[PDB]
Amino acid sequence: ISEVRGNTRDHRTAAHTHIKGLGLNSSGIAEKQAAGFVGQCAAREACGVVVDLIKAHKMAGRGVLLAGGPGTGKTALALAISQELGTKIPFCPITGSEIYSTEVKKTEVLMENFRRAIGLRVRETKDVYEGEVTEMTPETLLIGLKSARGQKKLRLDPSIYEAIQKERVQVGDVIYIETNTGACKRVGRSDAYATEFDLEAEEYVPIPKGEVHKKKEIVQDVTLHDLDVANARPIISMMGQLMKPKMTEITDKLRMEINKVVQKYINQGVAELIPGVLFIDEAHMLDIECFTYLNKALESPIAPIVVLASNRGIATIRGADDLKAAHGIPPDFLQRLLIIPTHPYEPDEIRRIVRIRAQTEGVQLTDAAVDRVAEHGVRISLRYCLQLLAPASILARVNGRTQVDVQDIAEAEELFLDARRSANILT
Amino acid sequence: ISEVRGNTRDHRTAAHTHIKGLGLNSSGIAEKQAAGFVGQCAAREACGVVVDLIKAHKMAGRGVLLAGGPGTGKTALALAISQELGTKIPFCPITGSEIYSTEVKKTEVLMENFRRAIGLRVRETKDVYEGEVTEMTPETLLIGLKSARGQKKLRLDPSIYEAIQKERVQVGDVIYIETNTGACKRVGRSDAYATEFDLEAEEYVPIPKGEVHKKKEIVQDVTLHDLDVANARPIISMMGQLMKPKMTEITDKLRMEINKVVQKYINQGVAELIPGVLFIDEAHMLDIECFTYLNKALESPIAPIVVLASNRGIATIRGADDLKAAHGIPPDFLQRLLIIPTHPYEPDEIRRIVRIRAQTEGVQLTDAAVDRVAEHGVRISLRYCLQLLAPASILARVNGRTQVDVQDIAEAEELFLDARRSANILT
Numbered sequence A, B: 001i002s003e004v005r006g007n008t009r010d011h012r013t014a015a016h017t018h019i020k021g022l023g024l025n026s027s028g029i030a031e032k033q034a035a036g037f038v039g040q041c042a043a044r045e046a047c048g049v050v051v052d053l054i055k056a057h058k059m060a061g062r063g064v065l066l067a068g069g070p071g072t073g074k075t076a077l078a079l080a081i082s083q084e085l086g087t088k089i090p091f092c093p094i095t096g097s098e099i100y101s102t103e104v105k106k107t108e109v110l111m112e113n114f115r116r117a118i119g120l121r122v123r124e125t126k127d128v129y130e131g132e133v134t135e136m137t138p139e140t141l142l143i144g145l146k147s148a149r150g151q152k153k154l155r156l157d158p159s160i161y162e163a164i165q166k167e168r169v170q171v172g173d174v175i176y177i178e179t180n181t182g183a184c185k186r187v188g189r190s191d192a193y194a195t196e197f198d199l200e201a202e203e204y205v206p207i208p209k210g211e212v213h214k215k216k217e218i219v220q221d222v223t224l225h226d227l228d229v230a231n232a233r234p235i236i237s238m239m240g241q242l243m244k245p246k247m248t249e250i251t252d253k254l255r256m257e258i259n260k261v262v263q264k265y266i267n268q269g270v271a272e273l274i275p276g277v278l279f280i281d282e283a284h285m286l287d288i289e290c291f292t293y294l295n296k297a298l299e300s301p302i303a304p305i306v307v308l309a310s311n312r313g314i315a316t317i318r319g320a321d322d323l324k325a326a327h328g329i330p331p332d333f334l335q336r337l338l339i340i341p342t343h344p345y346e347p348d349e350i351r352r353i354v355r356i357r358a359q360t361e362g363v364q365l366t367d368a369a370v371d372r373v374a375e376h377g378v379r380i381s382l383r384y385c386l387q388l389l390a391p392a393s394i395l396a397r398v399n400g401r402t403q404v405d406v407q408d409i410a411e412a413e414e415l416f417l418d419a420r421r422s423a424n425i426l427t
Ligand SMILES: Nc1ncnc2c1ncn2[C@@H]1O[C@H](COP(=O)(O)OP(=O)(O)OP(=O)(O)O)[C@@H](O)[C@H]1O
Pocket: A015, A016, A019, A036, A037, A038, A039, A040, A069, A070, A071, A072, A073, A074, A075, A076, A077, A281, A309, A353, A356, A382, A383, A386
């Protein structure tokens, strides 16, 4: 579990790195401009209440729905819900279109995302005693350990004395003993007393490196999916390795081996598992079979916070014989969650956002350029205008400038056109 | 091992029940008449020295040979060697003719006889604590056990507390705990909380009979062959059950399972194994392959005392291309042992023996009848005259008498004739 390192899809949250959380005071009322947020007071305060409902454990089989248009702070508020829940919490942003896979089933892909939303907080402090054995009999046992770069003799507690007698010991055996109720023995194992005659033996163990007394500090924050993806290999290259269509490395029997060891760490009290947040954009795209999986998922106490988002008003239920419902959510699951409405930003609110994103991205710009780009944030979507910051900075650097002006941003619209305008131009 | 009961061939030692051991004083000199012995002072004292050599552990790869005619106290002195070694020691009397089997090999039969000569002295005293669990948390643990006829609460030592935490416990579990460094748990097992719905479960254990606190006394004296013959069954009928020609119940893999558990009882210090005596009559009948097995056997420290007996002077070595040797023992094995000569008894010595056997067998006889039967002990063998005691007692009981006279013993010779006289009569 120490070797297991967390691999996170940072490209999804890359557009929200400018947001630090949810800007609100002690009473609960949202601030005008805090934590990288502009406006959206009604929706900010609303989910600022749901974070408390999770903390108070009052979200008994409940979820959240973010109703609003494109670029209305939906995905942004979802990340704020995680950021406000605790430190190093799992946030899994998905889109209904991601479920629509070619090889894996509609929920074999929804399963790993649920595993990507449930984490594990580890806080294990162990006192290592590695090396050989040099027995002495006092009034309750003295053993001298020999390591690769050190030698130390220690007067063991009578608790260890009972544990060592159970697992046969002799002078010249490599051992791993722990003060925190730990007993492990390697009978006769020692590379020092190994002859070159026998090779197939493997009955000997090398002399442990460093010192005998070692203070092992384990502070690990990994999701359940990280445990599955690390135990699948028969690991640095794996962050860029996926070129295989089948993806048969993750099998149901491999997950059972993870579920049992995770349970063992909870029973010991070493590490407790912490459920996070599962965000589903394009919630209407989800099949009826997916919603019934979610209904079963929400009933489990281990389950994370299922936050959905739908840009549609009235939509046909996917997986049903054409049944129009609100946001495309079936009634069975619509009642299961509380709806939070996300309001569109007026031109005055849009330029306040631009200045925050430019400051984070590292793009210097004139006051007049912010006004021109905000005009595109109201005529077209908020995502399109925000995308104009990076090409205009290159166009300015090329012209020798650091400050981006109207002339530089005018070319950005000419070169990089939105999906709506690009279609109409072709006629 | 408690269920394992010792089955011994009492018919072989039946003719020597009249002998209690070896009659000798503190200095070592043999008595005229003691322990059921008459004469044979030279041979009695000789093996009365070998018993001390075994006790002093000076019999380093050594044995004993009893050279003498038929009925010269050979088998009798061998039993005396066991009787003088210790209490409840194994004595295995064999004849060279027994090795000559139809199914098993010459040493597959010599092996079990060696297993019949190495015993195990057990002295285990255990403090049983059987019943359910009713946990209480004091300052190091209080558990109340519930048995079929009793209930008791006990304040356990902190040593048991560490052992119980290793093997998962809950309230209402049947447990077997020991004060003599013993820990055994049956997780969730209890017949009290068993529903009639599940049958294939077998996860529950019945409530232990009697009281919770039980003092188990185990004093067992069994040979290595007893452990093999009891573990062979998949046991009272077995004392008379042997009707199978193959005898495939005892396999090499079954013996390995006995060798490992016996070793475990020695390592714990519960029971130590004690080597006895292996007596081989008709030593000349043994094959050269048998003597090489004995040579390898005598070198082992676990080996019993190999006492041989040969009635032959110069005899050809069995298993060799006609090579005459002393007593039929090959030189390699002749040097390996010390020879004890057994002198034939004079008529005066024979009637002294008769009076001892008659007193043990329960046969009342006149002084004149002892003289007439002693005349047959000198003209014919000592075994033949000793055999005349039982039929003559029946002939006397039939005549209404309790005392056996000359007339009664005269008919016994007429009815039951020796092997020599029966042959010559036929002409
Ligand atoms: N209130 C806000 N304050 C600061 N930035 C905001 C605010 N609302 C939206 N944004 C930013 O707008 C940019 C693009 O919008 P985004 O893709 O996040 O839309 P969304 O409404 O959050 O989700 P959806 O994709 O479902 O519309 C992001 O960088 C987001 O953080």
